[PDB]
Design a protein around this ligand. Structure first.
Ligand SMILES: Cc1cc2c(cc1C)N(C[C@H](O)[C@H](O)[C@H](O)COP(=O)(O)OP(=O)(O)OC[C@H]1O[C@@H](n3cnc4c(N)ncnc43)[C@H](O)[C@@H]1O)C1=NC(=O)NC(=O)[C@@]1([C@@H](CC=O)c1cc(C(=O)NC3CCOCC3)cs1)N2
Ligand SMILES: [Mg+2]
Ligand SMILES: [Mg+2]
Length: 639
């Protein structure tokens, strides 16, 4: 059955073997008769199926046992063990669902959670359902963090996370079902328009895209086959490696051109010298002008010798003017890419800078895509009613203190205290005592200088250096709400090709949710940081000019409503999301996940998108990170 096999896959597990995490929790199983290993795997896979088939209701141990078939419904103890495991690690009974057995009246252990984004909310729900006392401290006047939906009238647009990157294996598939989140496929077709507004023809678009793919592939070869990862005692950036590959392509074009020029010059020299000898054989004919009868025959066989010598040379001439005009009619390219072509290629680079939220010259060549292996399957989807329905639903029933900005975290062998100020009256402060702190502060806030939050005692060097090495990027959006659709409704995406390499990320991509009279323009790469220093009105004006160039200056009305994100300037984010910087690696994500112990017991815990090696810079990654920490905290305090 790919019923039960599907459940494992859907939970990011192999259907047919135990994980190292399972091995640690079930040592007796992995070291015992392999027969009972299969039994374990079936129970695990089937319990997952029971949960995934109906994630709106709590799946209890009882109900699991009553739905298993003989003889598995007789493995009472093993079923309990598997159920307890799946629940603790948040593989079942996560997100938001109806409880069957209500929450324990008295609570055990106190946990403060810093930040009320998806990671914080996910962890809170887990810890609460485990019977712990949980309070979330949130600096904004709203939950959700980098999930941030603009709503006004019937305009909905996402200023933060917007895309569910495939459902196959994605825990957001469960959450989606739970909160009745309407999801829609993104059509792939993305026509590009040049700076002057003219469509890039199919032919040219496909050629350039192909070159982009070859260039990326080449850097991958250089990095992972030829091990070119360090230069002049500096780790190589992806940007740097792309520049090298491009330079080699240009050298090859120049070589082929030179070889061609040398063939032409050779042929021209041959022609010039054959003319010369044919001009001399002509002077030798001019000058050619014993019985009378034998002189005639003699000066006959003389010319026929000279003439079938010359006619012979007019033929080696013929095959040379031919070979020449074939050369000068079949040149190789004189450039690798034209000015125009390079601009279009820059569109593809801008697109990559968007995905990674940073200029390519900052990305680690070796590690930038270290998380490729863990991509989900299925089409990428958008959220029709706005992504914020997820954090809003996850907040239901939780103790969340809004407008409460944490400034100090103290942790000792005997417990912790967290100091926060009200962001509306920075006079009044609060002190919250607890057994454990879960820090979900964005990497951007952890990097902040001077610091936004003081840790007492200071975080150990192994942690701060990780914080310092890791990249934290930027990406912004301009939302344009119109009263009518003037664009093509069967297109979700279209691209604007900029005019310089440096500014390639400026308003390079426009996005529409179908029927919604809204366009989103993206600002990526070096442009992202710079354009935050421009007012909404000027940046809006620049969008309209681009759209006017494409659709006609008369087809584009003034927008009714606009919003512009400035993630870098936002004090509660300080950027958009992590990336693997040159000099960093996936190992730094693991370092970020590691709890601090002041043996004393661990007191300070870390969740957030920057703490999950396999799923960084995503909502699902934030969510999984929360589930992880909740599991570790409960293990520590509840056993
Ligand atoms: C603009 C933008 C776009 C995307 C994302 C982010 C942003 C900014 N994505 C990331 C996702 O949002 C984040 O990873 C998580 O939401 C982070 O959650 P965390 O819980 O880790 O962090 P938080 O910041 O939300 O919570 C922290 C809380 O702490 C509070 N706080 C700060 N300081 C405090 C103090 N002192 N005291 C108390 N509280 C304090 C803060 O207020 C905060 O609440 C994206 N994620 C996705 O899953 N999807 C998206 O769409 C992303 C994006 C990421 C790229 O990897 C993507 C874009 C695409 C895309 O466009 N692809 C398509 C191209 C066309 O073809 C189809 C596919 C794909 S993914 N976007
Ligand atoms: Mg190439
Ligand atoms: Mg420029």
């Amino acid at each position: 059955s790919s019923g039960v096999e599907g459940a494992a896959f859907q939970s990011r597990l192999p259907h047919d073997r135990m994980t190292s995490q399972e091995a640690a929790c079930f040592p007796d199983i992995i070291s015992g008769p392999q027969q009972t290993q299969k039994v374990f795997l079936f129970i695990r896979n089937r319990t997952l199926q029971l949960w995934l088939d109906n994630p709106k209701i709590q799946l209890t141990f009882e109900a699991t046992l009553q739905q298993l078939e003989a003889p598995y419904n007789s493995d009472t103890v093993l079923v309990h063990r598997v159920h307890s495991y799946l629940e603790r690690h948040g593989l079942i009974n996560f997100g938001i669902y109806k409880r069957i057995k209500p929450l324990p009246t008295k609570k055990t252990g106190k946990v403060i959670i810093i930040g009320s984004g998806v990671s914080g909310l996910a962890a809170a729900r887990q810890l609460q359902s485990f019977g712990m006392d949980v309070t979330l401290l949130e600096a904004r006047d709203r939950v959700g963090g980098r999930v941030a939906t603009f709503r006004k009238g019937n305009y909905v647009a996402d200023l933060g996370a917007m895309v569910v990157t495939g459902l196959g294996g994605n825990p957001m598939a469960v959450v989606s079902k739970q909160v009745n989140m309407e999801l829609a496929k993104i059509k792939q077709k993305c026509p590009l328009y040049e700076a002057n507004g003219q469509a890039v023809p199919k032919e040219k678009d496909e050629m350039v895209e192909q070159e982009f793919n070859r260039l990326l592939e080449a850097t991958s070869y250089l990095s992972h086959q030829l091990d070119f990862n360090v230069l002049n005692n500096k780790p190589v950036s992806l940007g740097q490696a792309l520049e090298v590959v491009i330079q080699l392509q240009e050298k090859h074009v120049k070589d082929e051109q030179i070889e061609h020029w040398k063939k032409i010059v050779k042929t021209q020299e041959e022609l010039k010298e054959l003319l010369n000898k044919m001009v001399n054989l002509k002077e030798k004919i001019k000058e050619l002008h014993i019985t009378a009868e034998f002189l005639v025959k003699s000066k006959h066989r003389d010319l026929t010798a000279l003439c079938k010598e010359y006619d012979e040379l007019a033929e080696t001439q013929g095959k040379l003017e031919e070979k020449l005009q074939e050369l000068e009619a079949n040149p190789p390219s004189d450039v690798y890419l034209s000015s125009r072509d390079r601009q279009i290629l820059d569109w593809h680079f801008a697109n990559l800078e968007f995905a990674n939220a940073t200029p390519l010259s900052t990305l680690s060549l070796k590690h930038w895509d270290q998380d490729d292996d863990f991509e989900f399957t299925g089409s990428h989807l958008t959220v029709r009613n706005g992504y914020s329905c997820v954090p809003v639903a996850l907040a239901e029933g939780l103790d969340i203190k809004l407008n409460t900005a944490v400034r100090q975290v103290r942790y000792t062998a005997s417990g912790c205290e967290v100091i926060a100020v009200n962001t509306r009256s920075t006079s009044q402060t609060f002190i919250y005592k607890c057994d454990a702190v879960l820090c979900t502060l964005p990497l951007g806030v952890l990097k902040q200088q001077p610091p936004a939050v003081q840790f007492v005692p200071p975080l150990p060097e192994w942690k701060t250096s990780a914080v310092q090495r890791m990249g934290f990027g930027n990406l912004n959006k301009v939302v344009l709400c119109f009263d009518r659709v003037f664009w093509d409704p069967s297109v979700n995406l279209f691209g604007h090709v900029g005019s310089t390499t440096a500014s390639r990320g400026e308003l390079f991509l426009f996005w529409n949710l179908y029927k919604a009279p809204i366009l989103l323009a993206l600002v990526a790469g070096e442009a992202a940081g710079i354009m935050e220093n421009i007012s909404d009105d000027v940046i809006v004006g620049r969008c309209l000019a681009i759209l006017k160039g494409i659709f006609g200056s008369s087809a584009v009305p003034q927008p009714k409503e606009t919003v512009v994100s400035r993630w870098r300037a936002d004090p509660w984010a300080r950027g958009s999301y992590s990336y693997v910087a040159a000099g960093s690696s996936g190992n730094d994500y693991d370092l970020m996940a590691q709890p601090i112990t002041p043996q004393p017991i661990p007191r300070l815990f870390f969740a957030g998108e920057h703490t999950i090696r396999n799923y960084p810079a995503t909502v699902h990654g934030a969510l999984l990170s929360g589930l992880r920490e909740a599991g570790r905290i409960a293990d520590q305090f509840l056993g």
